[PDB]
Amino acid sequence: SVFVGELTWKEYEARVAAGDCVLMLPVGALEQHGHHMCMNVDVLLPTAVCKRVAERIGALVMPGLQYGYKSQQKSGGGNHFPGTTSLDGATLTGTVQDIIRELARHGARRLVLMNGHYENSMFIVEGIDLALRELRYAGIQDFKVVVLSYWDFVKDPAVIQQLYPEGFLGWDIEHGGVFETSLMLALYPDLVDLDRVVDHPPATFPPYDVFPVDPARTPAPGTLSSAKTASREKGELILEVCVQGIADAIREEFPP
Amino acid sequence: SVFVGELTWKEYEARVAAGDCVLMLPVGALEQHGHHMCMNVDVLLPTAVCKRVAERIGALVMPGLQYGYKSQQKSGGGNHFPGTTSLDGATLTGTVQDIIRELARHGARRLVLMNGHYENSMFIVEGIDLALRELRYAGIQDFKVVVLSYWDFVKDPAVIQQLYPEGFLGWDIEHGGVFETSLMLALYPDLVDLDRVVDHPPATFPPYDVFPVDPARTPAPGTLSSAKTASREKGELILEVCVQGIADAIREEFPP
Amino acid sequence: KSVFVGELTWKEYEARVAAGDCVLMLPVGALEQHGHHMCMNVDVLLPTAVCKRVAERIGALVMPGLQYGYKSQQKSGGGNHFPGTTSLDGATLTGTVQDIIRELARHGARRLVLMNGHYENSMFIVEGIDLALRELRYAGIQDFKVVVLSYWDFVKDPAVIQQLYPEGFLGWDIEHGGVFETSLMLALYPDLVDLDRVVDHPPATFPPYDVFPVDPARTPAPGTLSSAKTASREKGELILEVCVQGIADAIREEFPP
Amino acid sequence: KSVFVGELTWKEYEARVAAGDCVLMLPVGALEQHGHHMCMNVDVLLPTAVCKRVAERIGALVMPGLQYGYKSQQKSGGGNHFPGTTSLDGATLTGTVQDIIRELARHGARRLVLMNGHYENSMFIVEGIDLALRELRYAGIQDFKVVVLSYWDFVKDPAVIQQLYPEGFLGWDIEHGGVFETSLMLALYPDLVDLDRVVDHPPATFPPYDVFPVDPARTPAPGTLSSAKTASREKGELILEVCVQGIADAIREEFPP
Amino acid sequence: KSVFVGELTWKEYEARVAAGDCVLMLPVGALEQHGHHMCMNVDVLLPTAVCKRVAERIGALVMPGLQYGYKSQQKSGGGNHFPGTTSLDGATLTGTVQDIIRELARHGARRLVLMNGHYENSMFIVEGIDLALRELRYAGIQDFKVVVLSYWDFVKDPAVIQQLYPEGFLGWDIEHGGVFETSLMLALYPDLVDLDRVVDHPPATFPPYDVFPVDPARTPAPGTLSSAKTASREKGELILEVCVQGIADAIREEFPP
Amino acid sequence: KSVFVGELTWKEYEARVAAGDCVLMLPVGALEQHGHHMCMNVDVLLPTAVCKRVAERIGALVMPGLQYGYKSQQKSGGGNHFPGTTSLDGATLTGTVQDIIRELARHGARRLVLMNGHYENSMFIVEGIDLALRELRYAGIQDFKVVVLSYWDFVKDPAVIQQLYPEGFLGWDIEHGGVFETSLMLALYPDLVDLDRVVDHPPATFPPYDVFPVDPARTPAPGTLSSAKTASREKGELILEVCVQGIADAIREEFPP
Ligand SMILES: [Mn+2]
Ligand SMILES: [Mn+2]
Ligand SMILES: [Mn+2]
Ligand SMILES: [Mn+2]
Ligand SMILES: [Mn+2]
Ligand SMILES: [Mn+2]
Ligand SMILES: [Zn+2]
Ligand SMILES: [Zn+2]
Ligand SMILES: [Zn+2]
Ligand SMILES: [Zn+2]
Ligand SMILES: [Zn+2]
Ligand SMILES: [Zn+2]
């Protein structure tokens, strides 16, 4: 198994003792994802990518963070929706910080944080800095962290054209849209009912944000773009591209 | 599905709209469990129990807390072991607090926290208190919480007698022993290898604790008792007793 | 000379720590209801009295005690809904323990005994200790050693237990305001106990789970979890000698001269 | 009359809020390196200058700006390893925003515009707002409204973008110490810019991931993420008018008189 | 009938609060070095003794005192570099005060007097009060009132001052371990004072600024900021009567029956 | 060359720190009501102006000032109940000071002067400094030195006081919006002062204790604690010269070039 949770402490110890062990931590959320998809998408997707990447490069995957930061209107619909269960920034930051501290204690020195929930980014960044700060007090400067949101690896114009023959709309509105829905159709079809997709024009907003969040400014379904054209085929493409790209990136930053 | 993460936000909203929806939250840890068992035991077990109880009483299960409080020598071997990845008390407390705040926002008013890691108890307690304190600030006083550790429902003398024809020696030393190992053999046999069990005598300690934790005071394998006599059958019985007992307790506290 | 740090001059304290093997003791209690027959500072008074006697025997020093502890829980203290009980949030207690260890380490002390007298304090004392040791480690300090214990855990001799609990040991959690604490109080501070006000009720029992908000009905009306009807000075004196002796021996073993 | 709260007496401020529809604006910046050609308080100076001009047009008031912001990130500000850059922890910035909102609500104010000038501040400003609104709700207050924006987002007109970047727009992320900010500075504070010191390097490019500890080698030597060689006072005046007009209109829309 | 809450049963306490105009008093001290002639728990002992006497006269109740206070400052307590002195971080002290007020309010109490005995505690007590009142407001509670004071501020009469300091008033800040505190201790706890060990140095003087890390050389070697050579039980009795009467009167005025 | 860090390039800043003896100065103020005759940013403007002049004379650099300070207290600033005054919680201010010191240390700086302009900030500045020095100690760094001062403490010469107050000085406590601050403002920013609006009331006096919630009636209606009727540009110029000279000499003493 490539999952730390499924290993005995002895097996884990031996792997870290190897010296070049790479650990991966998926960071997701419990968030509404329209009428056609379930709410644990942000955990399921990066976890599936982590598993596949780990199998290829000989890495290990830590239990994923199930709850993430508050959903923002322009990227995830808004934290006013039912189901969405978000943590305060301090809580998410502290969780990341605590995990890094513990991994360093084990003797680990290579960590990849794979974000699957757009809004988590800056709090992950702060948790990393606080953990690295503490390691520095002990004179430790060899703990290295690579942070990434898996969708950023789908850049190849050729790939983008296949997935979006009519044009890429941007990652900000890819919440419950073609990208996430296609991956889900390929990985967990039973958790997706494309027939329930509520077609609507791609969400647009003015150059600013308003709080309290105005529910009227988010498409009724909660999605920011339609997944009507999502498909298992597109999902298989996205999956291979991400796994390959991320596997290469990790081998690059954490070589033998 | 009985898992909130596998529902759409509309399906979840509908269940809460019913008025008497009971939500369940498993709280575990990533911790060493000897040479014969994996490290996510404390998440897997309460989650499996929650699932079965939820199926029986029509409740829903929230994503579980994967990381818990620091392992203590007398109950989990100690936080010095590799693999064990623990959170600070404030972090765990804050996580529980944030989740309750969000569930209340959804309109939910009935929550069952099922602890699977001994050491989490008091921090779960503080998280609950802080969240209820805030709810009262908003005039909300109808949010009710039931907290329990699933093993406390295995107290019937006849059951203990059948499970331990030699004698029960308390839940304290039941870390990686007969109880947890038997449950795992019944639910996830592939994650257990009885041939690797180190059959040492029950762990004993003086009436006080020492910090920094002294490794010599914990049996080398990390277990506090031998799981040599663990069996699938013992696990099936434990599972039956726990599910029935918790289901009855929840119906009592959260009637239709 | 006094065994209490508070009654020493800084020069005397400094000299004792300069010795090199000085052991410090910190009582951790609470302000909590203890039925109709006993006062509310029991959890401070008792561990403080034990520390004093242990200190006198092994040559240790006792720090001012923590007067307020963690929230009373229904199954071990009656519940935090009772009047009088004044509790701190976990972070507050944890931080207090953390600050004190930091300061003792600054003084040059390296041996500390935390003696808990309020059941609910345990885990927050543990977190306070971990956070303080973590910070000491940042400065390369790994020789600070801590021994934490709840004084009642030393009362284990089958023979002594039989006298206190003729019908069986009820468990340290439901001992709140019962025979154990009341007997000690009768022996140490009789003026603060009125055995005639004891409301005799059966030992408190609870289901295998807890409910919040706490339900007042599931706690005996007087606030006690077990009856102190049979409490006596004699039982108190026995408990006292057993604790002092056992704790003194434990400290001598962990912190040898 | 001044549009800055700091330059008013408390009586004058009180009267303005008593008006009932008073709009307050808070500039949120940072002290951060901005290449060899510009000073380090750019992120405070620019949003404050924009706030002043917007306030003059719509009759709003401007609060003292936040001088220190969140840690500079490699992909958007060069990195927090540079000298001069003085950053706050996320909790500190969030708490500052939170405290100010709480206080303004106490004054009776209910309309606030937070104008961010430092790319990295965004999410911590967002958390500060959420925590403050949460507290207001506890006190039964639900009419406090907040508008948050990063001023450069108002430069949307394809015609304006083309004038600034005739060879193509490469994004706001690498617009640190580049054409955009440098042009505005040339138009507002020319004495604080030495265009002759601009190190004309190719625009910064990074792989689809982040690495920590930040690797200095992955940031252009000067600290800038794009060359300001083509910056000019003319471009600056266009940007200024575009931002002021757009924001003024947005506020009139969200906070009608 | 004891005036200490800790020595009451929860029923007795409940009955007192039920009165409707009950006044609670909380001593806030510290564990701090006090020269070669006095013990280190002075800051707790003195305000507690004053609270007890005031309570007896006005029918109030006294809560367990805070044993540890904020970090000793050079100009008012000698400095936190001294052995023995065991200080809390500001957040810890503030949080302790906050938790206590929250609980007292839960009991139904609405009148609290915080009597400070350690100079440096003041602003953290103030913050704890503000945060507690803020929370009470969220709960719709606005009738909780707090009076905070440092007992020495009540010694104002010129005649009294001259009797105490024939050479001239030195200011309450340098009155650390000097005539004022030592005299009170001589009148209240003579066994904890050895006037023969007093080091008769001239009053400490400092430039108009502070330096950190604290420089030990800038504090008189004994730790005292002024000489207690002329301290006496007679002066102690005078101070005690002035403080008790003045405070009793002030409380009667702020918390009328 | 500017003495303000914000107006320097990171290269210029780096070079100055490289000198190995660079002194950094941080103004710490507040946004607070200052009567009917003066604006609310006084506490930022004054220490910043003093820092600028001192820096010009001794070759130091000035950091962006803290614009918001701790909650106004009745006896020193009128009270936090006034409109306009926008205060931070203690933890927020302490955290801001702490974060800035961490960053300056990272830059390689080791000499810092914090110039307080708001009475109430003092203890939180102190705690921020302690927490920062504590963390530096975790990294084996103990050569970072901090000097903290409130600029008005340098106006102590009897001859100067006599010239400024030919009718008698009554202390710094009541100098909120009075002669001292108003005179400085008249000399530095005359347009922000309108002496004709001064409410000439008698000096504020208070009992030896404080009450919370704060009672508005106990503060002079205008918000000032003493009348600035006799304030003048001349008095302001004198105060400025004395403060700048005194502070410059103190800094040279503590941080020799
Ligand atoms: Mn998401
Ligand atoms: Mn466990
Ligand atoms: Mn207790
Ligand atoms: Mn920036
Ligand atoms: Mn003191
Ligand atoms: Mn002020
Ligand atoms: Zn998603
Ligand atoms: Zn387990
Ligand atoms: Zn007790
Ligand atoms: Zn910038
Ligand atoms: Zn003292
Ligand atoms: Zn002022």
CATH of the domain at A61: 3.40.50.10310
Query: Which position has the token pair 């931002």?
Result: D243
Strand A110-115 vs strand A144-149: parallel, antiparallel, or unpaired? parallel
Q: Are A39 and A71 in contact (CB under 8 A)?
A: no
Q: How far apart are CA A16 and CA A59, in angstroms?
A: 10
Roughly how many angstroms between the first and final C-alpha of chain A, as a whole number? 20
DSSP category for residue C37: S
C-alpha dihedral over A243, A246, A252, A254, to 10 degrees?
-100
- Beta strand A209-211 pairing with D145-150: antiparallel
- Catalytic annotation present for F34: yes
Q: How far is D148 from chain A (nearest CA, A)?
A: 5
In this structure, what token pair is assigned to residue E101?
A: 């007020």
Q: How far is the CA of E117 from the centre of ligand 4 (A)?
A: 47
Rounded alpha-carbon distances, angstroms, from residue D132 to B102, C140, D127, E27, F255: 16, 40, 9, 33, 42
What distance in Å separates the CA atoms of residue B49 and residue B235, rounded to the nearest whole number?
A: 12
A85 CA from centroid of ligand 1 (Å): 11
Cα–Cα–Cα angle for B227, B232, B238, rounded to 5 degrees: 85
In terms of Cα–Cα distance, which of D152, D26, D44, D3 is closest to D97?
D26
Q: Is D31 helix (H, G, I), strand (E, B) or coil?
A: strand
Q: Is the dihedral of CA D157, D161, D167, D168 positive or negative?
A: negative
Rg, chain F, Cα only? 19
- What are E25's strand-pairing partners? E62, E113
Give dist(CA B210, CA C146) in Å, integer: 6
Phi and psi at A70, nearest 5°, equal -50, 130
Helix (H) or strand (E) holding B130: helix B121-137
Long-range contacts of F238-241 (CB under 8 A, 24+ apart): F238/F160, F238/F163, F238/F164, F239/F155, F239/F164, F239/F180, F239/F183, F239/F184, F239/F187, F240/F49, F240/F50, F240/F53, F240/F184, F240/F187, F240/F188
Report the side by side order of strands in the sheet with C24-28. B209-211, C145-150, C111-116, C24-28, C61-62
F-chain residue closest to C140, CA distance = F138
**C172 annotated to a ligand binding site:** yes
How big is the E-F interface in CB pairs under 8 Å?
97
The number of domains in chain B is 1
Contact D244, D8 (CB under 8 A): no
**Which residues lie below 8 Å from residue F205, measured CB to CB, with a gap of 6+?**
none
Please state, in angstroms and rounded to a whole number, the distance separating the CA atoms of residues C151 and A43.
46
Q: Do C212 and B122 touch (CB under 8 A)?
A: no
Active site residue ranges of A: 31, 33, 42, 117, 119, 175, 180
For residue C241, the surrounding DSSP H or E stretch is: helix C233-254
- Nearest CA-CA distance, residue E81 and chain F, Å: 12
Among the partner-chain residues F10, F39, F87, the one whose CB lies closest to the CB of D9 is: F39
Give the residue from chain D lying closest to E138, CA to CA: D139
Is E touching C (3+ C-beta pairs, cut-off 8 A)?
yes
User: What spacing in Å lies between the alpha carbon of D59 and ligand 4's midpoint?
Assistant: 28
CA angle C15, C16, C20 (to 5 degrees): 100
Tokens of A80: 């006013």
Cβ atoms of A82 and A44 closer than 8 Å? no
Judge contact between C249 and C147, C-beta under 8 A: no
Which of A128, A207, A249 is nearest residue D154 as measured by Cβ atoms? A207
Q: How far is A23 from C217, CA to CA, in rounded Å?
A: 50
Q: Are F254 and E211 in contact (CB under 8 A)?
A: yes
Distance CA B163, CA B170 (A): 13
CA angle E151, E155, E156 (to 5 degrees): 130
Q: How many CB atoms lie within 10 A of CB F56?
A: 15
The rounded distance, in Å, linking the Cα atoms of B136 and B129 is 11
Return the HEC string of chain A: CCEHHHCCHHHHHHHHHCCCCCEEEEECCECCCCCCECCCHHHHHHHHHHHHHHHHHCCEECCCECCCECCCHHHHCCCCCCCCECECHHHHHHHHHHHHHHHHHHCCCEEEEEECCHHHHHHHHHHHHHHHHHHHHCCCCCCEEEEEEHHHHCCCHHHHHHHCCCCCCCHHHCCCCHHHHHHHHHHCHHHECHHHCCCCCCCCCCCCEEECCCHHHCCCCCCCCCCCCCCHHHHHHHHHHHHHHHHHHHHHHCCC
Strand pairing category for F24-28 and F111-116: parallel
Active site residues of E: 32, 34, 43, 118, 120, 176, 181
Residue C15 structure tokens: 């000299």
Q: How far apart are CA A177 and CA A199, in angstroms?
A: 10
Q: What is the largest CA-CA distance in chain D?
A: 57
The C-alpha atoms of residue C33 and residue C218 are separated, in whole angstroms, by 16
d(CA F163, CA A78): 64
Structure tokens at D136: 């207001």
DSSP secondary structure code for residue E88 in this structure: B
Q: How far apart are CA D163 and CA D153, in angstroms?
A: 16
CB contacts of A8 in chain B (<8 Å) are 32-39, 83, 196
Name the residue type at position F149: L
With residue B146 as reference, give the H or E element that holds it: strand B144-149
Q: Which of A39, A87, A222 sits opposite B98 (nearest CB)?
A: A87
Give residue for tokens 């305060």: A88
Q: Closest approach of chain A CAs to the CA of F44, in angstroms?
A: 30
Q: Which of E134, E136, E141, E142 to mutate to test the interface with D (most CBs of D within 10 A)?
A: E134
Q: How far does CA A249 lie from the centroid of its chain?
A: 16
Q: Are the C-beta atoms of A31 and A66 separated by less than 8 Å?
A: no
At position E231, the amino acid (one-letter code) is A
DSSP state of D22: -
Q: Are residues D35 and D224 in contact, defined by beta-carbon separation less than 8 angstroms?
A: yes
Residue of E nearest to D134 (CA): E138
Distance from CA of E138 to the nearest CA of B (A): 5
Structural domain span for residue A49: 1-256
**Rounded Cα distance, C8 and E84, in Å:** 9
Residues B25 and B21: their CA atoms lie apart, in Å, by: 13
- Smallest-distance ligand from the CA of A179: 7
**Sheet of strand F210-212: strand arrangement:** E61-62, E24-28, E111-116, E145-150, F210-212
Query: Solving technique for this entry?
Result: X-ray
Residue A62 neighbours by CB under 8 Å, 6+ apart: A4, A5, A23, A24, A25, A26, A99, A103, B30, B85
E137 chain-D contacts, CB cut-off 8 A: 139
CA distance E49 to E183: 14
Catalytic residue among B117, B126, B190, B214: B117
How far apart (Å, rounded) are the C-alpha atoms in residues C149 and B208? Answer: 5
Do residues B51 and B112 touch, judged by C-beta distance below 8 A?
Answer: no
Question: Hey, is D243 helix, strand or coil?
Answer: helix
* C157 catalytically annotated: no
Q: In what order do the strands lie in the sheet with A60-61?
A: A60-61, A23-27, A110-115, A144-149, D210-212
Taking any CB pair shorter than 8 Å as contact, residues of chain A touching chain F are: 136-137
Name the residue among E176, E182, E245, E185 with its Cα closest to residue E45: E185
Find out whether E107 is annotated in a ligand binding site. no
Which residues of chain A have a Cβ shorter than 8 Å from any chain C Cβ?
134, 137-138
Distance B41 CA to ligand 4 centre (A): 46
| Alpha carbons B231 and B236: distance in angstroms, whole number | 9
Which of the following is catalytic: C181, C196, C215, C253?
Answer: C181
Contact D83 F13 (CB under 8 A): yes
Cα(F155)–Cα(D166) distance, integer angstroms: 60
D to A contact (≥3 Cβ pairs closer than 8 Å)? yes
Interface test with C, best of F130, F131, F133, F134 (most C CBs within 10 A): F134
Instruction: Say whether A83 and B32 touch across the interface (CB within 8 A).
Output: no
F147 contacts: CB under 8 Å, gap ≥ 6 = E209, E210, E211, F112, F113, F114, F250, F251, F254, F255
D41 forms bridges with which residues in the sheet?
A: none
* Degrees to nearest 5, angle at CA F5 with F3 and F10: 125
How far is it, in rounded angstroms, from Cα B187 to Cα B43?
13
Peptide bond connecting A212 to the previous residue in cis, omega within 30 degrees of 0 = yes
The enclosing H or E element of B115 equals strand B110-115
Measured distance CA(A136)–CA(E242) in Å, rounded: 55
For chain E, the residues whose C-beta falls within 8 A of a C-beta of chain B are 135, 138-139
What distances in angstroms separate CA D154 from CA A214, D29, D150, F256, one per listed residue? Answer: 21, 17, 8, 50
Residue E229 corresponds to which tokens in the numbers above? 């050579």
For residues D236 and D183, the answer to whether their CB atoms sit within 8 Å is yes
Report d(CA C68, CA F85) in Å as an integer. 36
Q: Output the DSSP codes for chain F.
A: --SBGGGS-HHHHHHHHHTS---EEEEE--B----SSB-S-HHHHHHHHHHHHHHHHHT-EEPPPB---BPP-HHHHS-TTSSS-B-B-HHHHHHHHHHHHHHHHHHT--EEEEEE-SGGGHHHHHHHHHHHHHHHHHTT----EEEEEEGGGG---HHHHHHH-TT----STT-SSSHHHHHHHHHH-GGGB-GGG---PPPP---SSEEES--GGGS-TTS-SS--TT--HHHHHHHHHHHHHHHHHHHHHHS--
- List phi, psi (to 5°) of B173: -80, 5
What tokens does B108 get?
């939910």
Terminal alpha carbon distance of chain E: 20
Number of CB atoms found within 10 A of residue D105's CB: 19
Nearby residues of A111 by Cβ (< 8 Å), 6 or more positions away: A22, A23, A24, A25, A100, A103, A143, A144, A145, A146
| Both structure tokens of F113 | 């002067």
Angle at B100 between CA B96 and CA B102, to 5 degrees: 120
Distance CA D41, CA D221 (A): 20
Cα D35 from Cα D178, distance rounded (Å): 9
Q: What is the D112 CA–ligand 3 centroid distance (Å)?
A: 48
Contact residues, chain A, for D122 at CB < 8 Å: 122
CA angle, corner A216, sides to A212 and A217, nearest 5? Answer: 80
Burial degree of F180 (CB within 10 A; 0-12, 13-18, 19+): buried
The string over C121-147, giving b where at least 16 C-beta atoms fall within 10 Å of a residue's C-beta and e elsewhere, is bbbbbbbbbbbbbebbbbeeeeebbbb
- Rounded to the nearest 5 percent, the helix, strand and coil shares of chain E are 50, 10, 40
Q: Is F173 annotated as belonging to a binding site?
A: yes
Q: Is B151 annotated as a binding residue?
A: no
Terminal alpha carbon distance of chain D: 19
- Chain E residues in contact with C189 (beta carbon < 8 A): none
CA gap F201, D85 in Å, rounded = 47
For chain C, counts of helices (H) and of strands (E) = 8, 5
H or E segment to which residue E210 belongs = strand E210-212
Q: Where are the beta strands (DSSP E) in chain D?
A: 24-28, 61-62, 111-116, 145-150, 210-212
CA dihedral B196, B198, B203, B209 (to 10 degrees): -60
**In this structure, which amino acid lies at residue A95?**
T
For D135, the closest chain E residue by CA position comes to E138
Chain D residues within 8 A of A155 when measuring between CB atoms: 208
Residue C144 CA to residue C134 CA, distance in Å, equals 11
Q: Using DSSP bridges, classify how beta strands B110-115 and B209-211 pair: parallel, antiparallel or unpaired.
A: unpaired
Chains in contact with B, where contact means 3 or more Cβ–Cβ distances below 8 Å, are A, C, D, E
Q: Which chain F positions have a beta carbon within 8 Å of A136's beta carbon?
A: 139
**CB–CB of C37 and E9 under 8 A?**
yes
Q: Answer yes or no: is F36 a known binding residue.
A: no
Strand-strand pairing, A110-115 and A23-27: parallel
Distance from Cα A116 to the centre of ligand 7, integer Å: 7
Taking CA atoms, what residue in E is nearest to D102?
A: E134
Mutation to test the C interface, candidates E103, E110, E195, most C Cβ within 10 Å: E103
Asked about C176 being catalytic, the answer comes back as: yes
Packing angle of the helix pair F233-254, F42-58 (nearest 10 deg): 50
Cβ-Cβ contacts under 8 Å for E108 (sequence gap 6 or more): C83, E17, E18
State the best of A208, A248, A251 to mutate against chain D, taking most chain D CBs within 10 Å: A208
